[PDB]
Design a protein around this motif. Structure first.
Motif, mmCIF file in Angstrom:
data_model
loop_
_atom_site.group_PDB
_atom_site.id
_atom_site.type_symbol
_atom_site.label_atom_id
_atom_site.label_comp_id
_atom_site.label_asym_id
_atom_site.label_seq_id
_atom_site.Cartn_x
_atom_site.Cartn_y
_atom_site.Cartn_z
ATOM 1 N N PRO A 1 -16.899 21.757 16.478
ATOM 2 C CA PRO A 1 -15.722 21.280 17.227
ATOM 3 C C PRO A 1 -15.916 19.865 17.803
ATOM 4 C CG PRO A 1 -16.099 23.598 17.684
ATOM 5 C CD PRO A 1 -17.266 23.150 16.838
ATOM 6 N N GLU A 2 -17.125 19.534 18.257
ATOM 7 C CA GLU A 2 -17.340 18.193 18.843
ATOM 8 C C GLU A 2 -17.311 17.061 17.826
ATOM 9 O OE1 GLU A 2 -21.424 20.329 19.022
ATOM 10 O OE2 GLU A 2 -19.297 20.939 19.022
ATOM 11 N N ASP A 3 -17.347 17.399 16.549
ATOM 12 C CA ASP A 3 -17.266 16.370 15.514
ATOM 13 C C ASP A 3 -15.847 15.970 15.145
ATOM 14 O OD1 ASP A 3 -19.966 16.095 15.613
ATOM 15 O OD2 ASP A 3 -20.364 17.454 13.949
ATOM 16 N N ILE A 4 -14.846 16.625 15.728
ATOM 17 C CA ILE A 4 -13.470 16.101 15.637
ATOM 18 C C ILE A 4 -13.334 14.998 16.685
ATOM 19 C CG2 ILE A 4 -11.038 16.545 16.005
ATOM 20 C CD1 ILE A 4 -12.509 18.061 13.648
ATOM 21 N N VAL A 5 -13.078 13.763 16.252
ATOM 22 C CA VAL A 5 -13.085 12.666 17.217
ATOM 23 C C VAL A 5 -11.677 12.172 17.587
ATOM 24 C CG1 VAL A 5 -15.397 11.866 16.648
ATOM 25 C CG2 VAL A 5 -13.405 10.925 15.456
ATOM 26 N N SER A 6 -10.666 12.625 16.853
ATOM 27 C CA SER A 6 -9.264 12.289 17.159
ATOM 28 C C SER A 6 -8.648 13.154 18.259
ATOM 29 C CB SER A 6 -8.419 12.391 15.870
ATOM 30 O OG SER A 6 -8.593 13.671 15.272
ATOM 31 N N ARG A 7 -9.344 14.223 18.636
ATOM 32 C CA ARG A 7 -8.892 15.123 19.703
ATOM 33 C C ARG A 7 -10.171 15.618 20.322
ATOM 34 N NH1 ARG A 7 -4.457 18.848 20.679
ATOM 35 N NH2 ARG A 7 -5.201 20.658 21.904
ATOM 36 N N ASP A 8 -10.243 15.618 21.648
ATOM 37 C CA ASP A 8 -11.428 16.127 22.331
ATOM 38 C C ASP A 8 -11.275 17.642 22.438
ATOM 39 O OD1 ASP A 8 -13.429 16.837 24.209
ATOM 40 O OD2 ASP A 8 -13.358 14.750 24.978
ATOM 41 N N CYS A 9 -11.803 18.348 21.440
ATOM 42 C CA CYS A 9 -11.512 19.777 21.301
ATOM 43 C C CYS A 9 -12.278 20.632 22.308
ATOM 44 C CB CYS A 9 -11.768 20.261 19.871
ATOM 45 S SG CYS A 9 -10.669 19.454 18.662
ATOM 46 N N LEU A 10 -13.436 20.164 22.757
ATOM 47 C CA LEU A 10 -14.113 20.918 23.828
ATOM 48 C C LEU A 10 -13.329 20.907 25.144
ATOM 49 C CD1 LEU A 10 -17.896 20.173 23.330
ATOM 50 C CD2 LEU A 10 -16.495 22.045 22.404
ATOM 51 N N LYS A 11 -12.562 19.842 25.391
ATOM 52 C CA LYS A 11 -11.794 19.746 26.620
ATOM 53 C C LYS A 11 -10.388 20.321 26.468
ATOM 54 C CE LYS A 11 -13.900 15.758 28.979
ATOM 55 N NZ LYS A 11 -13.716 14.317 29.445
ATOM 56 N N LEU A 12 -9.761 20.111 25.306
ATOM 57 C CA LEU A 12 -8.333 20.440 25.118
ATOM 58 C C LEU A 12 -8.052 21.603 24.173
ATOM 59 C CD1 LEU A 12 -6.865 16.793 24.995
ATOM 60 C CD2 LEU A 12 -7.165 18.346 26.951
ATOM 61 N N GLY A 13 -9.104 22.209 23.636
ATOM 62 C CA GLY A 13 -8.957 23.277 22.654
ATOM 63 C C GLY A 13 -8.737 22.731 21.256
ATOM 64 N N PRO A 14 -8.665 23.617 20.254
ATOM 65 C CA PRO A 14 -8.556 23.174 18.859
ATOM 66 C C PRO A 14 -7.262 22.449 18.561
ATOM 67 C CG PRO A 14 -8.196 25.549 19.074
ATOM 68 C CD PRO A 14 -8.760 25.080 20.377
ATOM 69 N N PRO A 15 -7.266 21.670 17.468
ATOM 70 C CA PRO A 15 -6.032 21.055 16.969
ATOM 71 C C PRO A 15 -5.086 22.159 16.516
ATOM 72 C CG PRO A 15 -8.009 20.210 15.816
ATOM 73 C CD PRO A 15 -8.377 21.513 16.519
ATOM 74 N N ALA A 16 -3.835 21.805 16.253
ATOM 75 C CA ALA A 16 -2.924 22.770 15.654
ATOM 76 C C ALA A 16 -3.304 22.959 14.189
ATOM 77 C CB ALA A 16 -1.482 22.292 15.772
ATOM 78 N N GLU A 17 -3.008 24.125 13.637
ATOM 79 C CA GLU A 17 -3.311 24.350 12.233
ATOM 80 C C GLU A 17 -2.451 23.426 11.378
ATOM 81 O OE1 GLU A 17 -3.882 29.110 12.656
ATOM 82 O OE2 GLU A 17 -4.742 28.159 10.879
ATOM 83 N N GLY A 18 -3.087 22.760 10.422
ATOM 84 C CA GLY A 18 -2.406 21.789 9.593
ATOM 85 C C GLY A 18 -2.461 20.378 10.150
#
Lengths: 119, 119
Positions: B48-65
């Motif tokens: 999850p921390e390797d997604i850099v366009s959204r801070d997923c540890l702070k805001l949760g996962p991206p939307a599917e798609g």
């Protein structure tokens, strides 16, 4: 498929792939061997000098179907079977510091393509 | 498929993969993301921390798609689309010098299996 458990000794892999910009100085012809590794993977760009069970530069290629041992650049040795040869190219490249090396096509990328996640 | 010619600037790849014996100290659960890279390759073990366009540890996962940018450990960035998550394991390992690191299953090999030609 195999289960990894606490207390087990295992081997771990650590990639350190590097990429460099370089200039193509020459394109030459090169004989490559085609080998089937015991794992079922098939290589068409094996260097003749990387067969270590037969000195192929001195004695010529193995017989087709012959069992060979192949060295990988980190010294790991692999069983394979020799299945023929082809002629392809090598690319002499020059780096920013003026050093040079000959590279296989598989290791070259244009400035437009995505570099692989192998790093 | 693309033709490489004398005088061209290209990028060359240089592998330096290392392998080490280590001991499994712990097995833990870890949430991984599943992403389809723009190149059509599909990863099921993205941190999850390797997604850099959204801070997923702070805001949760991206939307599917959702379109995301993914960082590779050497800093290269890749476009992808997020397609869900799974729970798998991480393996805490200890090296001969006493240092430790957490490893993904894909980077672990038993003492019986062949190590890959990736090196």
């Amino acid at each position: 498929e195999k289960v990894i458990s606490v207390g087990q000794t295992v081997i771990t892999k650590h990639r350190n792939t590097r990429y460099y910009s370089c200039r193509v100085m020459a394109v030459t012809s090169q004989t490559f061997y085609e080998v089937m590794f015991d794992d079922g993977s098939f290589s068409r760009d094996t260097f003749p000098e990387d067969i270590v069970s037969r000195d192929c530069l001195k004695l010529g290629p193995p017989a087709e179907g012959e069992v060979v041992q192949v060295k990988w650049p980190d010294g790991k040795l692999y069983g394979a079977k020799y299945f023929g040869s082809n002629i392809a190219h090598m690319y002499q490249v020059e780096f920013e510091d003026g050093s040079q090396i000959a590279m296989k096509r598989e290791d070259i990328y244009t400035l437009d393509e995505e570099l692989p996640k192998r790093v």
